[PDB]
Amino acid sequence: GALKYLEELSKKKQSDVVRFLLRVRCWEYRQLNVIHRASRPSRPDKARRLGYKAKQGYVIYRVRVRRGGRQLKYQRSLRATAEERVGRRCSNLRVLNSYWVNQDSTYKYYEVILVDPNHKAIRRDPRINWICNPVHKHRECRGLTSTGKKSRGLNKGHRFNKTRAGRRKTWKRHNTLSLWRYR
Amino acid sequence: SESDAVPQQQQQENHIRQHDLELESKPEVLRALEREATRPVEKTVRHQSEREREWLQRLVDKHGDDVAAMARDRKLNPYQQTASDIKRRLKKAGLL
């Protein structure tokens, strides 16, 4: 049960050992590329609860994103921008999920989990082979990931009345004049 | 007569059967379907494996009918089973 100890550590990320590790890793990542491949996740507890498995077909990619304003504000999140740049880089993979890994004064650093839909280790596993279907091509561009669902407001309740079934679908329905035959 | 006021006593007829349901002028199709439901079936009795019979026969050949000693034995009962499990397997194999 080592991963329960890691979950409590990520909670305390201002603390002495986690501030030290985030400092020495953010320094290392600045000399690296903007988008580069990570052999293993920096937070293996977070990746695994987001869906990462140590199988042939799962890869981890680390990306830095510029932080600040676009006072115009970009409605696209920094996490969604992190997903979209990696999916452009790996046009053959599928973006599964992403998580925060580090940040700086200029950049924000994210690790993204990708799944190879053509690897037949992936194709044979019923827990993941839904992603081999072509309705899951480029989920990060359609807002189908966890960042996208948050920014689209796909939550139950009276607070999310305009957006829970699709915001534009709601507007088209309410702005349609419906005429029947026997009026 | 209802001493405890039970709203379910009048509709009566904690383990139940889990796979089937113990149940109680008309159209010809309905009468034909009733003959399909009530038709007698095949038992299809499972059998003990050959090594399972050898394991059980070795236990009778040592301890006879003492189920307590067979469960308490370790050489001939490696996967330690209770006497209640061994007694059921003996009664299925015909070795009492």
Partner: peptide, 21 residues
């Protein structure tokens, strides 16, 4: 299909029934 799913289909499959009038 998964082993858990096959186990549930083996022992609790869809039955064939009717309801009388």
């Amino acid at each position: 299909v998964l082993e858990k799913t096959k186990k549930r289909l083996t022992h609790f499959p869809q039955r064939k029934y009717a309801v009388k009038a």
